[PDB]
Amino acid sequence: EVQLQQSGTVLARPGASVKMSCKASGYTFTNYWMHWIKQRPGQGLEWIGTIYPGNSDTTYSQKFKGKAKLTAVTSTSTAYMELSSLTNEDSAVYYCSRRNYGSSYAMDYWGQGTSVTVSSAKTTPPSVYPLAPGSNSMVTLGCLVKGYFPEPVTVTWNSGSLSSGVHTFPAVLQSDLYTLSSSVTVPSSTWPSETVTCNVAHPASSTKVDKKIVPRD
């Protein structure tokens, strides 16, 4: 029943600073130490520091002194981490977690994590392109989502009906712009006989595009 809910995704510009929160419930907030962990994309976890909400006591990893500032608000059962002088190196997911004693001695409960992107590039809708085969029992179609920023983006095929045989690849950095692609395999008797459509939803720019895969020749 103990659960830690963390604030939402954040986009910040170099030199700026952001403040995130970790709302705790399920235990006596002031009795346990709350820890913070960083994780650069495609990287391992890294301990940042900890705070004892009970009396605002803190400890930081030398690497994070002056970078991270931890605080807690007893009344709201909320822990906060403020990162300042942001750079690309701070772009990552940040987790909060409670260190339990007794039943267990470790970090048993974690937050869902807060994502932080440091960049001086503005929101850009993605251009969605159909990938139809040029000229087998199954056939592969595709969808190219190019030049958007920042993450993330939602891609489904046929509003979601087509689920299996789909492979939406990780977004790659295209010079301050993200790029990903999605493939889907279906029966030859299904396509082109029946049209297939990819849906692309870019949150950041509140954009929703539907692209039909039209055959060629």
Binding site: H35, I37, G44, L45, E46, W47, T50, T59, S61, Y95, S97, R99, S103, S104, Y105, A106, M107, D108, W110, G111, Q112, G113, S127, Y129, P130, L131, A132, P133, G134, S135, T140, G142, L144, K146, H167, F169, P170, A171, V172, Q174, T179, L180, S181, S183, T185
Partner: protein
């Protein structure tokens, strides 16, 4: 001096097999109170780390017997008696006493029979060419092991520029890997050539898989 080193970097094990994850500290990590706070955590793709083992050998409420933690002083080991498909992800050892430190992590990949990829190539979409760009996409889906090589060829010559690849996490259902390689050129350079090729060399063959298309067809 605080370093928590893990080995191997990546551990391939077929279902039901035994798995041994090592973690060495550079100094004795026993607390002055006599206890040794070494913990193990597991994190699957896009999820918050989970607690498996605390105090070296103690299992957390909800973790099956198949998981074992042993060791002392400067060496600790995590054993998975009968690896399931649901066990893949990254394992991290963590030293919980002052100056908490995570190990680098050991990716647990599930071994399955070698499977050649399914390559598909796609020419630029009329919409993109209209934009002035020209992306040629090539999908290499559901293959194993991951170690794969993709080489692009425009009229026989190899091209390394404007090539971006992205890989999927080992599929939890079939344990295969998929990759998407994208060769990007402007429309003008795209239309000054004719044959575009995507080549994949994989452990499953000598004769690489080649998929091309002629602009003039």
């Amino acid at each position: 001096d605080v370093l928590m080193t893990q080995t191997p970097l990546s551990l391939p094990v077929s279902l039901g097999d035994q798995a041994s994850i090592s973690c060495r500290s550079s100094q004795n990590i026993v607390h002055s109170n006599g206890y040794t706070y070494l913990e193990w955590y597991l994190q699957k793709p896009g999820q918050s780390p989970k607690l498996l083992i605390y105090t070296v050998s103690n299992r957390f409420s909800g973790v099956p017997d198949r998981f074992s933690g042993s060791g002392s002083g400067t060496d600790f080991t995590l054993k998975i008696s009968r690896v399931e498909a649901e066990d893949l992800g990254v394992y991290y050892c963590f030293r919980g006493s002052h100056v908490p430190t995570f190990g680098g992590g050991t990716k647990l990949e599930i071994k399955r029979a070698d499977a050649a990829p399914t390559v598909s190539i796609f020419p630029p979409s009329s919409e993109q060419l209209t934009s002035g760009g020209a992306s040629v996409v090539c999908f290499l889906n559901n293959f194993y092991p991951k170690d794969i090589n993709v080489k692009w060829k425009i009229d026989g010559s190899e091209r390394q520029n404007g090539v971006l690849n992205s890989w999927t996490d080992q599929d939890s259902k079939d344990s295969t890997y998929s990759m998407s390689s994208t060769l990007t050129l402007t429309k003008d350079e795209y239309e000054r050539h004719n044959s575009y090729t995507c080549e994949a060399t994989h452990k499953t063959s000598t004769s690489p898989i080649v998929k091309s298309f002629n602009r003039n067809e």
